[PDB]
Each structure stands twice: as structure tokens, then as C-alpha cells.
From a paper:
The density map of [name]‐α‐D‐Xyl identified the sugar donor in a well‐defined pocket where Asn148 coordinates the uracil moiety, and Arg208 and Arg158 coordinate the phosphate groups. Among the 17 well‐defined direct hydrogen bonds with 1, there are four H‐bonds between [name] and the nucleoside moiety and three specific H‐bonds with the Xyl moiety. Thus, [name] recognizes 1 with very high specificity. First, a double mutant (N148A, R208A), targeting those enzyme residues involved in the interaction with the ribose, the bases, and the phosphate moieties of the donor, was analyzed. In contrast, significant STD signals were observed for the acceptor 6. These results provide support for the proposal that the side chains of Asn148 and Arg208 are key for the binding of the donor, but do not affect the binding of the trisaccharide acceptor. Introduction of point mutations such as N148A and R208A affect the binding of the [name]‐xylose donor, but not the recognition of the acceptors. To understand the details of the glycosyl transfer mechanism, the geometries of [name] in complex with the donor and acceptor were initially superimposed. However, inspection of the superimposed structures showed that the distance between O4 Fuc and C1 Xyl exceeded 3.0 Å, too far for the nucleophilic attack. Additionally, it was deduced that the orientation of the [name]‐α‐D‐Xyl donor with respect to the Fuc moiety in the acceptor was not the proper one for the nucleophilic attack to take place. Hence, we hypothesized that a conformational rearrangement takes place for catalysis to occur.
Residue numbers in the entry: -2 to 278
The structure:
């Protein structure tokens, strides 16, 4: 009903999606959702019994046969056919997950969103988890320097990321950013991203990527390869590509005009949407 254009996006400091906010939300057992780090699903030693085993100081044993809402994240691991036995539990009303990798209506994707700043005793997390710096940049005048921003660690998924660097590095309509994860390097990254219409947001070790959401919060269009993990985000202004070949200035100019003209479900970018989505169970 209240959909809007990407350029009309406004953010408050608590809007930003992080996995910590959903984990934190689920800590209040009143809301009837159990949060399990995906590793404890993949390497379960019982078919239907799992535990966070002291992750986030949570040592509760979870009986999935008596769990109405399951939420998994804080892991590059996906939910796939290997978890079909858990999905088929008649008692489970919904499975909210990062990296959905099975076309099952019970399994609901949620955005990876931004790095968890509170990740105990981690400098990198403290830096690139700063949502205040995202909010800060998002309120400055958006002045476009170029068409597409490129700043990716190729090593993390080279079959896609190597093609992007090899094909597009030398284009006049591409701006390269050097990887720097200092507090100044992170600010520079966000300011660079903000000053482009698009950024390359290829998948990494995990299918979902922080860069995808960082781009959208800065009202920049992320370019992402089509994947079942992304199939529930088609109502966000993401440019979904079949492959990484034959991206041209004329192609992106046209896609910019089409995407910026449409209305999008931008409330999906705000954590309150996913609180309410869980609260519906
Ligand atoms: O110059 C830069 C570049 C990057 N960054 C930060 O670094 C983050 C990660 O960028 P990288 O390309 O190195 O990492 P990836 O995108 O491959 O991995 C990310 O998404 C996929 C998940 O599986 C990974 O756990 C997550 O780190 C960016 O989202 C951004 O927050 C900077 O702060 N400055
Ligand atoms: Ca690069
Ligand atoms: Ca193509
Ligand atoms: Mg069992
Ligand atoms: Mg996961
Ligand atoms: Mg998951
Ligand atoms: Mg992280
Ligand atoms: Mg990381
Ligand atoms: Mg990029
Ligand atoms: Mg992809
Ligand atoms: Mg063309």
C-alpha cells in the first residue's frame, strides 16, 4: 500500500536490519520464536534436537518437534534439501532464515542486512557494523560521480567476482575502490557507494551479502546474480542479472530509468517489518 521510489527512502537510527536485532528480538520467549546459529542445524547430532551449545551464552536444548517458529542466521551456511526432514515437521509454522536455498513455502528469507557491531570483542565488526555512519552518509547531498562502483574481495567467490574485475575494471563508467576496513576506509566505502547509481553486489562465501543492503540504505541499486536465495526480494530495487557478461553503459542507463521510476516495498529494508512478520506467528 505505502510503497515508494528508492530516492524517497528515509531512515531512522533503529531501522537498520542486523541478525543481532532478530536474535535479540527472539530472546523474549513471549514472541514464541527460537533463534539457532545455522552451524548447529548443519552439524546436528540428532535429527530433531539442536542447541546453540553456549553461542551467545545460550545452552538451551531445542526440540524442533515442539518449535512453532525457527529463525537461523549468523552463518554463511544455507537452508537446502539437507534440512527437508526438519521443514516437514507439521508443528513448524515458519522457518525464517538467511541464505534460503530450497523452494519451500514454509522457508521465509530475511535480509542479511548490516554487520553486527556488538559481536563481542571484534574490531572489524565494531567498524563495518557502524549503522550511524550509514545514516550519516544517507542524509548528505547525493552527488553522482559515476554509473557503477566496484569494490569487492574477489577471493570470497571468484567464479563470479573474478569475471566482474576482469570485464569491467577499465570502463570509464566504473569507479574502482581499494579494499580498506579502517574507520576512515569504511566511511570512504559508504561515501563512494552513495556517489554511484549502481554497485556490483555479487554473492560471497555466503549467497546473501552485507554490500547488497548497504547499497539500498544509500539509495544505490545493487547488481546481483539471480538465485533462489534472492527470489523473495524482487519487490526491492535490486538489478537481478542472469550472468555477469555484456553489462554496458546503455544497459545500465535503461535499467536505472526503469528502476527509479517504479514503486518498491522499501519497508522490507526496516527491522520493524520483520518483527511484525515474526509476530504474525
Ligand atoms: O573498502 C571497503 C570495502 C568493504 N568494506 C566492508 O567490507 C564488507 C565485506 O566486503 P567483502 O567483499 O570483503 O566481503 P563479502 O561481500 O565477500 O562478504 C560478506 O558478505 C557475504 C558473507 O558471507 C560474509 O560473511 C560477509 O563478510 C562490505 O560489505 C563493507 O561493509 C569496507 O568497509 N570498506
Ligand atoms: Ca575491486
Ligand atoms: Ca548478460
Ligand atoms: Mg531426533
Ligand atoms: Mg545461515
Ligand atoms: Mg539461515
Ligand atoms: Mg560480518
Ligand atoms: Mg564477516
Ligand atoms: Mg561494488
Ligand atoms: Mg547471487
Ligand atoms: Mg547493451
Amino acid at each position: 500500500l505505502g510503497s515508494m521510489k528508492l530516492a524517497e527512502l528515509t531512515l531512522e537510527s533503529d531501522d537498520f536490519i542486523t541478525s543481532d536485532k532478530l536474535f535479540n528480538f527472539c530472546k523474549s520467549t513471549i514472541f514464541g520464536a527460537k533463534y539457532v546459529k545455522t552451524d548447529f542445524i548443519k552439524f546436528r547430532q540428532y535429527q530433531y534436537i539442536v542447541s546453540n551449545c553456549g553461542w551467545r551464552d545460550d545452552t538451551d536444548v531445542v526440540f524442533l518437534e515442539n518449535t512453532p517458529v525457527l529463525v537461523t542466521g549468523h552463518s554463511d551456511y544455507d537452508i537446502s534439501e539437507r534440512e527437508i526432514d526438519i521443514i516437514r515437521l507439521p508443528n513448524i509454522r515458519a522457518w525464517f532464515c538467511q541464505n534460503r536455498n530450497i523452494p519451500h513455502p514454509k522457508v521465509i528469507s530475511f535480509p542479511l542486512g548490516i554487520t553486527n557491531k556488538d559481536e563481542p570483542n571484534s574490531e572489524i565488526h565494531r567498524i563495518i557494523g557502524n549503522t550511524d555512519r550509514i545514516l550519516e552518509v544517507s542524509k548528505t547531498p547525493k552527488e553522482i560521480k559515476n554509473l557503477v562502483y566496484m569494490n569487492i574481495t574477489v577471493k570470497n567467490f571468484p567464479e563470479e567476482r573474478q569475471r566482474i574485475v576482469d570485464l569491467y575494471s577499465d570502463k570509464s563508467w566504473v569507479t574502482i575502490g581499494k579494499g580498506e576496513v579502517s574507520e576512515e576506509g569504511h566511511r570512504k566505502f559508504l561515501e563512494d557507494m552513495y556517489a554511484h547509481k549502481f554497485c556490483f553486489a555479487p554473492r560471497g562465501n555466503g549467497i546473501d551479502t552485507h554490500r547488497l543492503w548497504e547499497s539500498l540504505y544509500l539509495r544505490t541499486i545493487p547488481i546481483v546474480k539471480k538465485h533462489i536465495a534472492m527470489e523473495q526480494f524482487t519487490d526491492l530495487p535490486i538489478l537481478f542479472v542472469n550472468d555477469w557478461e555484456n553489462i554496458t553503459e546503455e544497459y545500465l542507463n535503461e535499467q536505472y530509468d526503469i528502476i527509479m521510476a517504479k514503486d518498491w516495498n522499501l519497508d522490507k529494508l526496516k527491522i520493524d517489518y520483520w518483527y511484525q512478520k515474526i509476530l504474525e506467528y
